[PDB]
Amino acid sequence: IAGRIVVLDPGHNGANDSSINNQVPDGRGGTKSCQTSGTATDGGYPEHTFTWNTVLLIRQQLTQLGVRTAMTRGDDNKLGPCIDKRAEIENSYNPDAVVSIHADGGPAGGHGFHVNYSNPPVNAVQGEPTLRFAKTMRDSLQAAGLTPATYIGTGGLYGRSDLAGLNLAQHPKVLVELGNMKNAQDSAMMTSPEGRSKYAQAVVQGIVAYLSGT
Ligand SMILES: C[C@H](N)C(=O)N[C@H](CCC(=O)O)C(N)=O
Ligand SMILES: [Zn+2]
């Protein structure tokens, strides 16, 4: 584990302007918006702040394990990089694994996590190395006591073709939607410092299990 390289992507920006509506190539024949604002709890806790703070806790834990780390943005209050640039930044580190952190907006009764991965793969590394990452992450999150999303995906997994950050990956990568910000239970956990710590520890368990060959 020590000496491996992991890049962490806290989804969305600290702030936005109309540049986020410019279209960028999506890695699968199309284009999509440079960025989106992301969602928020009904209490007003923004997705971009949840992902930022959770990624900071993941980074701190990985560094203590001897893992070399980088992030795709440096703050939670200004314009951040477009989704295609974030994939380029991740790729430039030649990482062993990449984890993108998001939180979702779904029906209010729906809760739990889902692990998004590229499907069908557009290159070799998006095949078995990435599907294994997705399954291992899902297993680790569930073994940590988190609930697979009750409202989307299949047992906490979601293979998809529409995400530029996944299509553009040159290294094993998953995008973890940790929960539904519009749900009472997930909102409480996301808004809780110790809830963010528990999310972060479970993600780290998934990273360790994947890099260890579990
Ligand atoms: C994952 C989320 N539902 C989403 O669509 N995010 C969106 C697109 C990310 C991508 O295509 O890589 C975003 N701008 O963060
Ligand atoms: Zn998001």
Q: Helix (H, G, I), strand (E, B), or coil: what is residue 4?
A: coil
Integer Cα distance of 163 and 176 in angstroms: 12
Closest ligand to residue 52's CA = 2
Angstrom distance (rounded) from CA 85 to CA 179: 25
Q: What is the dihedral of CA 144, 147, 119, 104, to 10 degrees?
A: -110
Atom of ligand 1 nearest to the CA of 116: 1
Nearest atom in ligand 1 to the alpha carbon of residue 87 is 12
Contacts of 132 (CB under 8 A, 6+ apart): 172, 210
Which of the listed residues 86, 152, 163 should we mutate to test ligand 1's pocket, taking the one with most ligand atoms within 8 A of CB?
163
Cβ pair 171, 90 in contact under 8 A: yes
Is residue 112 within 8 A of residue 179, CB to CB? The reply is: yes
Q: Which of 102, 178, 180 to mutate to test the pocket of ligand 1 (most atoms within 8 A of CB)?
A: 102
The identity of residue 106, as a single letter, is: G
Can you say whether the dihedral through the CA atoms of 203, 180, 36, 197 is positive or negative? negative
How many Cα atoms sit within 13 Å of 96 on the Cβ side?
Answer: 16
Whether the CB-CB separation of 117 and 172 falls below 8 Å is answered with no
83 touches ligand 1 (CB under 6 Å): yes
Q: Which amino acid is at 198?
A: K
Sheet hosting strand 5-10, strand order edge to edge: 68-71, 5-10, 97-104, 173-180, 114-118, 157-160
Of 47, 88, 90, 177, the catalytic one is 177
Q: Does the CB atom of residue 36 touch ligand 1 within 6 A?
A: yes
Atom of ligand 1 nearest to the CA of 166: 12
Query: Is 88 known to be catalytic?
Result: no
Scored b (16 or more CB within 10 A) or e, 123-159 reads eebbeebbbebbbbbbbbbbebebebbbebbeebbbb
Amino acid at 154: T
Experiment used for this model = X-ray
Q: Which of 41, 47, 42, 43 is nearest to 16 (CA)?
A: 47
Structure tokens at 65: 């394990």
Residue matched to tokens 């710590």: 197
| The token pair that represents 131 in the structure block | 């599907």
Closest of 210, 214, 201 to residue 62, by C-alpha: 201
Look-up of token digits 């909102």: 187
Read off φ and ψ for residue 185, nearest 5 degrees.
-70, -45
With a CB cutoff of 8 Å and minimum separation 6, the contacts of 86 are 9, 72, 73, 165
Residue 2 Cα to ligand 1 midpoint, Å, equals 30
12 lines ligand 1 (CB under 6 A): yes
